[PDB]
Design a protein around this ligand. Structure first.
Ligand SMILES: CCCCCCCCCO
Ligand SMILES: CCCCCCCCCO
Ligand SMILES: CCCCCCCCCO
Ligand SMILES: CCCCCCCCCO
Ligand SMILES: CCCCCCCCCO
Ligand SMILES: CCCCCCCCCO
Ligand SMILES: CCCCCCCCCO
Ligand SMILES: CCCCCCCCCO
Ligand SMILES: CCCCCCCCCO
Ligand SMILES: CCCCCCCCCO
Ligand SMILES: CCCCCCCCCO
Ligand code: NA
Ligand code: NA
Ligand code: NA
Ligand code: NA
Ligand code: NA
Ligand code: NA
Ligand code: NA
Ligand code: NA
Ligand code: NA
Ligand code: NA
Ligand code: NA
Lengths: 89, 89, 89, 89, 89, 89, 89, 89, 89, 89, 89
């Protein structure tokens, strides 16, 4: 193989791999939306708990975000700091 | 490989990768719709908290939107600021 | 590669990418339908609140629509303002 | 490439793209069925709210339909007003 | 390309596209089954509402059916009124 | 292309298309099982309502079955009344 | 094409098609398990109505099984009464 | 084609088909786990029903297992009693 | 075909088939986690019945595990007791 | 085939197989998160049974982890103790 | 095969495998978001137990994170400590 062909196929696979990783983003959208619904329900019933409600919502939602960030980091590595092109030849 | 062939396959993979990333959009639609349902329930029950209900709904929904935006950004990079074509040759 | 072959494969991948992006439309249908169910249950108990119920339903449903629109925009770019064909050669 | 080969591969990809877009139809079926179930439960407890129940059900269900329509439009463009065949050569 | 080869690949893709579109049928089965479950609980508790329960169930279920029909129409077009074979050559 | 090659690839795609369509069967199993659970719950609490419970369960379940039948019909057409082999040559 | 090559590719596609159809089995497992859970809850509260509970559970579960059987039939046709090999040549 | 090539491709497709069929196992795990949760909840609230609870749980769970077994049987046929290799040549 | 080529493609397909079968593991994780949540709720309410809550939880969870084990067995057969390599030639 | 080509394709398939197995990890995340939510609500209600709540949560969550571990083991075998490379030639 | 071709295909498959493993991230986002919603609902009722609530939420969420981490580790091994390139030749 020539080197341009090698990079071409490794980078093409990297594009597919990056987009596939981003499918993980479904999870945080579902879970965080649930937490938001419960926060809405609680502050209508208890306006006085609005600090605790919102601070607790944000903490718990932040934890649920992490796997969306992991996928994003893997995608950005593949696009901008691609680790395979340097292993070639 | 010639250079037109190299770009052709890298850009074709980028189109597939971009569309695949957008599958993440399922999540925010599910979660944010749940939050909207709880907000509807709560206005009817306690009309006086409409202000808090809606502001809390929008904050929590904004957080649930983020992974849909991340996918969108990855797709737009692949289509409009493609990082692979410049690594070629 | 000749130029017709280059466009052919880039546009074929664009068709697949566009259709795949549209899978995101599952999410808004699920979430918005939930919000509609809660609106129905509340109108029934609390007709004095039909105003707020429906306006709140529509606002929250509008937010849940956004990722379905993002996919639609990516699909229409790929079909009607294709950004790859101009990068070729 | 000859022109018949170019059209053949672009149209074959368009067929796959169209069918894939239609997977979005899962969402409206799930969400609208939920809204129908809530409408049933309320007409039987509150026969006097049948007008508001059904009109609210239909409005909210109409909103949940939109992403199923978007996919259908993309599929029908690819089959009947295909935008790629004219970009060729 | 010869013309038999062109039709062969376009029709093969059409078969895959048609079957893929039919995956949408998951949605109506889930949503309509939910609506049926609510109708069952309701007639038991409020048998003097049977007429409304069942008529409301059927109306709301009919709306939830539509995206299953759209997929079916796309599949039957691809199999029986295939729009690509005539664009060839 | 020779004619045996043409039929071979069209029929191979038909087999894949048929099996893929059958994935729709997930939906009716989920929804109809829900309806069955509600029927069980109601006959235990209201044994004297068994008549309307079971007739309502079966009607609503029948409606939820339809998209599973549509997929089955598409699969059986592709296997036993294949519409593509006759369009060839 | 020779005839062994024709059968080889048609039967290979049939194996993939058969396994794919079997994915439908997810649905009955989910729905029937729900119905079983409701039956358990119900006998605990109404020991007396065990006869009806169980007979209703089994009837409703039988209906939810049907699409799992349809997929199984399509798979067994493709493996043991394959309809494509006889259309060849 | 030679005969070793024919068997190679039919058996490779059989391996993919077998693994794909096993995806059905998701369903019974979800449904049976639900039934187990309800059994747990009811042993607490009504300890005089432990016998009915567990026997009903196991019956209903057995029914929910069937589609996981069907997939398993199809996989084991493809691996150990492969029906395609004998149709060859 | 030579024999090394035959084994290579059969074993490559076996690796893909094995990994695909393992997707079934989603189901037990979902269902068993539900059962664990109900057990947590039933001990809190009745700390004194901890032994029958837990014995029922474990029995019902064991049943929900079975399809995860079936997939695991199919994967381990394909990797360590591969049935296809001996059918070759 | 030469031996480097044989290993190359078997190891490439092993990488795809390993990543696919890891999709199973969705299940434990969903189920274990449910169990955690129930533990949180139960310690709010009942601070006495906290030891029991947490010990029950951890036991039930451990059981729900197992299929995530099985996939992980299959992936690590394919990457670090690959059983196919030794069957070659 | 030459050695550059061998590495190229093994690394391209590794990119696809890595991205696919990251799909597991859906699970923790869903489950952890649920746990966050319950934590919100419970502080508002029981402000006095915020201690217990948040520490229990974080412990249970940490357990639900594990399979997202496993996928991440497999992806980072494939990208940065690739075990296949050294088995080659
Ligand atoms: C999924 C990986 C795509 C890599 C395709 C490269 C094809 C190049 C052919 O010359
Ligand atoms: C999924 C990546 C698609 C790349 C296909 C390129 C094929 C070019 C063949 O000449
Ligand atoms: C998924 C991308 C499809 C691109 C296929 C191009 C194949 C042309 C072969 O000569
Ligand atoms: C998914 C896109 C299908 C296009 C396949 C075209 C293959 C023609 C080969 O000569
Ligand atoms: C998914 C589209 C299938 C089209 C395959 C055609 C292959 C013909 C090769 O000669
Ligand atoms: C998915 C459609 C399968 C068709 C593959 C035909 C391959 C024949 C190659 O000569
Ligand atoms: C999915 C259908 C598989 C058919 C592959 C046949 C390939 C034979 C190549 O020579
Ligand atoms: C999915 C079916 C795999 C069959 C691949 C056979 C390829 C052999 C090529 O010579
Ligand atoms: C999914 C099965 C993979 C088999 C691919 C074998 C390709 C060998 C080509 O020479
Ligand atoms: C899914 C398995 C990938 C194996 C691809 C091997 C292709 C090598 C071609 O030279
Ligand atoms: C899914 C694995 C992608 C490997 C494709 C390699 C194709 C190289 C052809 O020369
Ligand atoms: Na997380
Ligand atoms: Na988010
Ligand atoms: Na949105
Ligand atoms: Na919509
Ligand atoms: Na509809
Ligand atoms: Na229907
Ligand atoms: Na059925
Ligand atoms: Na069953
Ligand atoms: Na089981
Ligand atoms: Na387990
Ligand atoms: Na875990």
């Amino acid at each position: 193989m020539d080197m341009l062909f090698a990079k071409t196929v490794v980078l093409a696979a990297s594009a597919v791999g990056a987009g596939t990783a981003m499918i993980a983003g479904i999870g945080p959208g579902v879970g965080q939306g649930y937490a938001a619904g419960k926060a809405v329900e609680s502050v209508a019933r208890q306006p006085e708990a609005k600090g605790d409600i919102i601070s607790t919502m944000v903490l718990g939602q932040a934890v649920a975000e992490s796997t969306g960030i992991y996928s994003l980091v893997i995608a950005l590595i593949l696009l901008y700091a691609n680790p395979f092109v340097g292993l070639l030849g």
